[PDB]
Paper text:
Morphology-1 has a width of 11.5 ± 0.8 nm and well-resolved cross-overs at a distance of 46.9 ± 4.5 nm (n = 50). Subjecting the cryo-EM images of Morphology-1 to a reconstruction of the three-dimensional (3D) map resulted in the subdivision of the extracted fibril segments during 3D classification. The two distinct 3D classes were identified and refined. We hereafter refer to these two structures as Morphologies-1a and 1b. The 3D maps reached spatial resolutions of 3.76 Å (Morphology-1a) and 4.05 Å (Morphology-1b), based on the 0.143 Fourier Shell Correlation (FSC) criterion. Morphology-1a is C2-symmetrical and consists of two structurally equal, in-register protein stacks. In the case of both Morhphology-1a and 1b, extra densities were observed near the contact sites of two protofilaments. We find that the majority (~66%) of the fibrils visible in our micrographs are mixed and contain segments from both structural forms. The segments of the two structural forms are not randomly scattered throughout the mixed fibrils but occur clustered into distinct z-axial regions of variable length. These features imply that Morphologies-1a and 1b do not represent systematically distinct fibril morphologies but sub-morphologies that are able to coexist in mixed fibrils. Despite these differences, we find the interfaces between the adjacent protein stacks to be formed by the same two amino acid residues (Met311 and Phe313) in the three fibrils.
Author numbering:
A (entry chain D), B (entry chain F), C (entry chain H), D (entry chain J), E (entry chain L), F (entry chain B), ...: 304 to 348
Write the structure that this text describes.
Amino acid sequence: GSNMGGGMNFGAFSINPAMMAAAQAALQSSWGMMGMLASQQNQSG
Amino acid sequence: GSNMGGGMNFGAFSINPAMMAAAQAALQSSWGMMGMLASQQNQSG
Amino acid sequence: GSNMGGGMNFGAFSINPAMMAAAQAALQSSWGMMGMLASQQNQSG
Amino acid sequence: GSNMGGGMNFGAFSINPAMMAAAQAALQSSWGMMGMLASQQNQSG
Amino acid sequence: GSNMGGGMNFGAFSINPAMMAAAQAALQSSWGMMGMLASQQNQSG
Amino acid sequence: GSNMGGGMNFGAFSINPAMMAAAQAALQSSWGMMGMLASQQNQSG
Amino acid sequence: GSNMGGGMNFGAFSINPAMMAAAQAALQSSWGMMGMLASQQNQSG
Amino acid sequence: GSNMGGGMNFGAFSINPAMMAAAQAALQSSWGMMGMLASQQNQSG
Amino acid sequence: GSNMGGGMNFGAFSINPAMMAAAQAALQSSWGMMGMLASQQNQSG
Amino acid sequence: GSNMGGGMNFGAFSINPAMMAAAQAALQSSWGMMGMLASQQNQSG
Amino acid sequence: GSNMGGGMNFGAFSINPAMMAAAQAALQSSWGMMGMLASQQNQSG
Amino acid sequence: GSNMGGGMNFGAFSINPAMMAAAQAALQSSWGMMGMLASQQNQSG
């Protein structure tokens, strides 16, 4: 069980994420004002 | 079970994400004002 | 079970995501004001 | 089970996503004000 | 089971997505104000 | 069980995260004003 | 010379004005979303 | 010379003005979302 | 010469003005979201 | 020459003005979110 | 020459002005979020 | 020549002004978040 309060952002967020990855499983998620991500990267041997 | 509060953003978000990946499974998700992502990248051997 | 609150964005989001990927499975999703994505990239050996 | 609240965006979103991919399976989805995508890219050996 | 709330966008979204792909299966979907896409790209060996 | 209070940010957050990873499982998530992420990267041998 | 800008009202205005007057000249004008009134009630002795 | 800027009101204005007057000249004007009134009540002795 | 800037009001204004007057000239103007009034009540002796 | 800047009000203004007057000239103006009034009540002896 | 800057009010202003007057000229103006008033009550003997 | 800077008020102003006057000229102006008033009450003998 999880919960988050609500917030207000007046400023302008200039985000410039730059990502690189190399794996058996890879997920790369960039988001702006609000987001939630639940990623289950299952693996065996 | 998950929950998120509601927020208000007056500023203009100029986002410029740049991503590169190399994997057996790859997902790359960029989004603006609001989003949710549940990605199950299942794998065996 | 997941839940998200509602938000209001007055600013104009100029997004310029640029993505590159190389995998057995690849998904690349860019979206503007609101979105949800549930991607199950199943894999065997 | 998933749920999303409703939001209002006054600003004009100029999005310019640019994507490139190379995989056994590839999906590339760009959308504007609202969207949902559930992509199951099944794979065997 | 999935659900989405309703939103209102006053701004004019000038979208210019540009996509390129090379795969055994390829789907590329660009849309404006509202959309949903469920793509099952099945694969064997 | 988790809970978070609500906050207000007047300043404009210019974030420039730059990330690189190399693993059997890799997740890299950059976000702006608000987010939550629960990632279970399961592994066997 | 007079001038007015244009506005947008999403809310539903339930107005219930109740007026009573007793004069040599009487005008009573109730209006909803938009209006202009120029009433010259001239009088002598 | 007069000038007014344009505004947007999301809330629902429930107005209930109640007015009573007794004069040689009487004007009573109730209005909702937008209005202008120029009333010249001229008088002599 | 007069000038006014433009504003946005999210809240719902419940106004309940109640007015009573007794004069040689009387004007009573109640309005909701936006208005301008220029009333010249001229008088002699 | 006069000038006013533009403002944003999130709160809901419940106004309840109550006014009473007795004069040779009387004007009573109640307004909600925005207004301007220029009243010249001219008088002689 | 006059000038005013622009401000933002998050709180809900519950105003309850109550006014009474008795004069040769009387003006009584109550307003909510923003206003300007220039009243010239001219008088002779 | 006059000038004012812009301010932000998070608190909810509950104002309850109560005024009474008796004069040859009377003006009584109550306002909420922002206002300007230039009243010239001219008089002779």
